[PDB]
Design a protein around this motif. Structure first.
Motif, mmCIF file in Angstrom:
data_model
loop_
_atom_site.group_PDB
_atom_site.id
_atom_site.type_symbol
_atom_site.label_atom_id
_atom_site.label_comp_id
_atom_site.label_asym_id
_atom_site.label_seq_id
_atom_site.Cartn_x
_atom_site.Cartn_y
_atom_site.Cartn_z
ATOM 1 N N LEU A 49 0.762 -1.429 -0.082
ATOM 2 C CA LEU A 49 -0.129 -0.018 -0.257
ATOM 3 C C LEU A 49 0.873 1.217 -0.033
ATOM 4 O O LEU A 49 0.607 2.375 -0.921
ATOM 5 C CB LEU A 49 -0.871 -0.016 1.160
ATOM 6 C CG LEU A 49 -1.728 1.242 1.155
ATOM 7 C CD1 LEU A 49 -3.105 0.882 0.196
ATOM 8 C CD2 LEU A 49 -2.739 1.430 2.824
ATOM 9 N N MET B 103 2.707 1.793 -3.420
ATOM 10 C CA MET B 103 1.574 1.950 -4.235
ATOM 11 C C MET B 103 0.981 3.499 -4.258
ATOM 12 O O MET B 103 0.948 4.013 -5.295
ATOM 13 C CB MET B 103 0.514 0.981 -4.184
ATOM 14 C CG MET B 103 -0.377 0.966 -5.482
ATOM 15 S SD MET B 103 0.167 0.348 -6.903
ATOM 16 C CE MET B 103 -0.180 -1.389 -6.834
ATOM 17 N N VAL C 168 -4.862 -2.449 -0.760
ATOM 18 C CA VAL C 168 -4.114 -2.199 -2.071
ATOM 19 C C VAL C 168 -4.445 -3.035 -2.917
ATOM 20 O O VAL C 168 -3.853 -2.971 -4.281
ATOM 21 C CB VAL C 168 -2.445 -2.525 -1.514
ATOM 22 C CG1 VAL C 168 -2.456 -4.168 -1.205
ATOM 23 C CG2 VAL C 168 -1.372 -2.328 -2.474
#
Ligand SMILES: *C(=O)[C@@H](NC(=O)/C(=N\OC)c1csc(N)n1)[C@@H]1N=C(C(=O)O)C(=C)CS1
Length: 244
Positions: free
Chosen positions: A112, A115, A133
């Protein structure tokens, strides 16, 4: 050359009308963005990117060494919504099949925090991935407009995104879906199933001469439609404009 703009606009509208959909296709030639179809006000509306996000997921995963282009993502042996997903495949195969579980695995590898940083760094859509995510491109909160999708396609087609040249070339190689005369069409589809359902086909035409013409088709899908209507409207529109 001699076909009126009134005739082009009527023809491309009729492709969406005949599909019993509402939609737009945005075409960019150089810096000029042209909006066609039967629902032009969709052009600056936000929709989930659905599986179009696989293009950026792949760029992020390759750039950050979360995968290689030859790496085989093994099927975990569990039953899939789609039986063609029940096999071991590369990222490129996953791109062609839209194998969501492979892109979910890649997203989990990135994680996460990375990203969210990378989606913010590329300035993709609303840039918001939220807290999950592995499904933020499918159910929200990430959203993007058709104008933003054609501009992303333009950036990738010209190697303008903030990734290595090799990363962008690796992902472009995964996106070839059709060759027509000497033209190549590079594109990624999306279908946000589960009303209203969004359908996408986002990419570019590479003409014989080397010119790249980005496009983004965005349309309302309904239960009973074939996914191939996205391809059919896109190809008819590009042929009508003499792009292919
Ligand atoms: C990508 O767009 C992906 N779509 C989905 O996973 C679905 N929703 O996305 C927000 C979905 C599939 S079944 C369901 N209840 N929801 C892939 N898209 C296609 C496509 O044609 O573009 C597929 C063939 C596989 S799933």
């Amino acid at each position: 050359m001699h076909i009126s703009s009134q005739q082009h606009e009527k023809a491309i509208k009729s492709y969406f009308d005949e599909a019993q959909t509402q939609g737009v296709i945005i075409i960019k030639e150089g810096k000029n963005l042209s909006t066609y179809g039967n629902a032009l006000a969709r052009a600056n509306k936000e929709y989930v990117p659905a599986s179009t996000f696989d293009m950026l997921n792949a760029l992020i995963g390759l750039e950050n060494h979360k995968a290689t282009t030859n790496e085989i993502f093994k099927w975990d042996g569990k039953k899939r919504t789609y039986p063609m997903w029940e096999k071991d495949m590369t990222l490129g195969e996953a791109m062609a099949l839209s194998a969501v579980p492979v892109y979910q695995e890649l997203a989990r590898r990135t994680g996460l925090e990375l990203m969210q940083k990378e989606v913010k760094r590329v300035n993709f859509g609303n840039t918001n991935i939220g807290t999950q995510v592995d499904n933020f491109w499918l159910v929200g909160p990430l959203k993007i407009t058709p104008v933003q999708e054609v501009n992303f396609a333009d950036d990738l087609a010209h190697n303008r995104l903030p990734f290595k040249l090799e990363t962008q070339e690796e992902v472009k190689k995964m996106l070839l879906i059709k060759e027509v005369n000497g033209s190549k069409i590079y594109a990624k589809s999306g279908w946000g199933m589960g009303t209203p359902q969004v359908g996408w086909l986002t990419g570019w035409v590479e003409q014989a001469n080397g010119k790249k013409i980005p496009f983004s088709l965005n349309l309302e899908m309904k239960e009973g439609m074939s996914g191939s209507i996205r391809n059919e409207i896109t190809y008819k529109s590009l042929e009508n404009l003499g792009i292919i």
